[PDB]
Structures are given as C-alpha cells and as structure tokens.
Amino acid sequence: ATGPRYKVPMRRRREARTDYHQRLRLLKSGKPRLVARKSNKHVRAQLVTLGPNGDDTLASAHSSDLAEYGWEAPTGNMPSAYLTGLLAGLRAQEAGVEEAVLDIGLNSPTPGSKVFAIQEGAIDAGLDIPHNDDVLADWQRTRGAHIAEYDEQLEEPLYSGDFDAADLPEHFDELRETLLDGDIEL
C-alpha cells in the first residue's frame, strides 16, 4: 500500500476470517476438518477436505434446513447446534467419511459452547473425532433445558409468537429421534 516494500497480509487474514497458524496445525492430522461455524440466527457444520485449488466440502448441514425435518423452533441455540452437527455428521457418514478434527475457526474453546455442541452431534452421528467429554455441555443444556427454565421466569413469552410459550426440549428429542433412522438426504 505504502511502497514496493510494503507487506500486504494474505486475503483471508485481512478479512479477519482465517487463522492460518491454527489452520496449519489443523491440516497436520491429515484428516477431514469438521468446520463448526455460527451466525446470529444460524449454525453451520461442514466436513472439509483438502484440494488442489482449495478446500472441498464433502458433507454439510445448516441449522435452517433443519426444519425440513420438523424443526419449528429458533435456530441459534444449543439444541439447534447439536442437531445441525448430527445432521451433517450423518450426511458425512453417507459420503463415506469416517473421522475428522474439530475446526472452530476464530471462535473460543469455551466449555458447553455451541461449537462443542456441534462436535458432540457429529460424533454421535458416528463420526470419529478427537475430543474431550468434559468440555461439553451436560446433555440437558444441549436439549435446551436452560432455555425452558428461563421461560419459567416468564411473565412474557420468551418466544415472540414462534411456537409454544414454555418451549420444548422435547421437540429436541423428537427431532434427534427422527434423524437416527431412514429419511431423505441422510
């Protein structure tokens, strides 16, 4: 920018999107990466492989195409994350993918985080991923219990219209249950 000698960082570093030092440690395993990403409203889960002209995504799952299976709740929470994980985990299996390592990009390794939720789901789908059980949420929170109880302190619906007033961690089970057998795109 300043002169011929100036050093312009790699594009994905400028865009503050890729941590290249972590990426390299990630690529070391020689295994597929389980890309766990989030958005204010959604949660994505991709299984990426390395390619000649860039990465190749062999299987993915987005919290939005979750309803496609009977999801009638918000998509930016823990239960959402797990499920999207499990869904992508399953499509992964179908793709012949058997193991992967957890890439959580620029996110933080916080215990019980949605990215680890995504990791727990992918694992249960059958994917073999190096992990650590006690860095994960305690199932109930995964189910969405923390949110149901939060609505117990109601007085005003936690959900603007949406579905239910007291929310449903049960709707969570029905869905996970669904995903564990038959159905299209899995």
Binding site: R5, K7, Y20, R23, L27, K28, L50
Partner: protein, 95 residues
C-alpha cells in the same frame, strides 16, 4: 571464507524479498509426495524447521520414502550420492 558454519554466505539465499516476508501459506507445507517424484529443494526463509544444508538449495532429487512427516529425498552432490531429510515446506514438484 572467514568462518565455516552452515549459514556462511547464505545472506541472499536464506532471505525473503520484502513482499514475501512473514509466515508462509500452509497449503505447501502439507503437500504430499509419492516415492519416485522429482522435487526441487529450496528452503523457505519463513519456515524454520524441516530445513536441509544450505548447499543443496537448487538440487532436484527423488522422493524415496519419508521419516516422520519429513521426506527422505535422494540427491547427488557432485559425484556423491546423498539422502536429504526435508519437509514439504521446502519442496516443489518438478514440471
């Protein structure tokens, strides 16, 4: 020379042009080669490990097995056959 260490007179060959300065792309440090391939040896000034002796910068050898993640490349120094322990980070496919 005034000294005889491995980096003697390597000012040029082990320095980056101002713009290629800083950490290098990980794509090439992970590249995979097969036994028999021809690979050009060139140290990446920006990549610390996996290096080989500066004298061989420029050589084009043959991948013959690996050691850990590092590769074992056979070359011929003048008339002597040698085997060089090097990482992908410092190798390129010929042609």
């Amino acid at each position: 020379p005034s000294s005889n260490g491995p980096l003697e007179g390597t000012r040029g060959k082990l320095k980056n042009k101002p713009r290629d300065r800083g950490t290098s792309p990980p794509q090439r440090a992970v590249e995979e080669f097969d036994d028999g391939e021809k690979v050009h040896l060139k140290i990446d000034p920006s990549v610390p490990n996996g290096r080989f002796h500066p004298r061989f910068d420029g050589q084009t050898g043959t991948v013959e097995g690996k050691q850990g993640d590092a590769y074992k490349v056979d070359i011929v120094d003048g008339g002597k056959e040698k085997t060089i322990i090097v990482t992908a980070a410092h190798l390129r496919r010929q042609e």
